[PDB]
Symmetry: C2
Subunit: 95 residues, 2 copies
Amino acid sequence: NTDTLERVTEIFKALGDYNRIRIMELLSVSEASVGHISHQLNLSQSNVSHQLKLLKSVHLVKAKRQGQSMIYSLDDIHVATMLKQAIHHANHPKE
Amino acid sequence: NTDTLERVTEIFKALGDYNRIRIMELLSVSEASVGHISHQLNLSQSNVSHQLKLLKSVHLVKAKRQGQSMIYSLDDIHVATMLKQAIHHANHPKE
């Protein structure tokens, strides 16, 4: 036992609802309000607000203030590319 | 409209108990019986037999029969290397 493994346990633990990935995708490229993103993506603002919280508290996502409304957005392109690589291999080649 | 994503969902979903990673570690080095691993690895074999069950059905691990007892073992060294990279990067390049 130790703190090393315990860490790798936090990452996976951070994960929760699947829909989360959805927002992440749109976030990877784009920027809108807190509700707008919800309404459109046919989502109940009841959860949204709740969601961001966690992740944000996980150090995964980062928020930024500008005038009034807050616009989210990733700061570590690493995960962005990492996810693409995982999806790029989703289906092996052909043989 | 969720044939591609549904996949990435199965992966993360596959995960379950933490002790999992642990066993995987020892399983990614030496191969032993079902108990021995549980005994020496201070673990209630009650879960083991129950553990592999899942993963197996997930296609993550592949069992092997030869003689009598079945010795488990990975097949896609990819995951093994992938994990190493995750922990290898989990390094705070200072600051």
